[PDB]
Amino acid sequence: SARLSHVTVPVLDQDSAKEFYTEKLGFEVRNDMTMGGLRWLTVGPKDQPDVEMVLRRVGAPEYDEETAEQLRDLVAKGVIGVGVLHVDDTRATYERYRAAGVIFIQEPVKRPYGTEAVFRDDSGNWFSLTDARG
Template structure:
C-alpha cells in the first residue's frame, strides 16, 4: 500500500537559478545537491515539511533523447509544465513577504470557494497556487 509522496519533479531552465529562487525567495532549504551519473540531483523543500523533496530537474541529453529535451524546454518556455499548490496559514501576509522578495505573482490574494488563493511563477515559468484553506 502506498503511504506517501516523497519526491515531485519540476523541470527548470537552469538549476542554479532555480536553487536561488526556491531557497532565497521562497525560503526553502536544499535537501540534496549532488552529481550522479552525468546529471545533477538537486532537491529542495519547505523547512517545516521534511518528508517532501522537490526535484529541480534541468532536462538534458543523456537523461532524455534530444527531441524530448527540446520539447520539454519549449513547454517550460511557455509556462505549460508547472503546477503545484502551497498552503499557508495567511495568504495575504505570505503574498506580501514573497512579493517583497521579488516573486512574480500572476494574481493577488483572492477569495475562492476553497479559501484564499494567489498564483505566482518561478524563474522558469512554472506556476503555483499559494492557498490559505478555508476553515471549517
C-alpha cells in the same frame, strides 16, 4: 505502504532554480549531489520533511534533444503547474514573496476554499498559493 517523497519540477537551469527556491521562496536545500553526471538537487519548505521538490535539468541525456526543446518551450510558457503550496495566510506570503522578487500571475483572490494566489518560478513553472483563509 507506498508514499510520495518527491515531486519532479522541470527546470531550465539548476543553479538559477536553486537560487530562486532558496533565496526567494525561503525553501532549504535538502540534497545537492551529483552521481554519474546527474545533479540530484532537492528542496523543501522548512517545516515539511515528508515531501521534497526535485529540480530536474531538462537536457541531454535524460531527455532526447527534440523532446528537450519541446519541454523547455512548454516550461517557459507556464504550462507546467507543479501544485499547491498551503500557507496560513496567502496575503502575507504573497507580500513576502513579492517583496523578494517573485512574479505573481494572479494576486490573492477569495475562493470558496480559501484565498488563492498564483506565482511562477524562475523557469516559468507555476504554483498555486493557498489558505483556509487567514
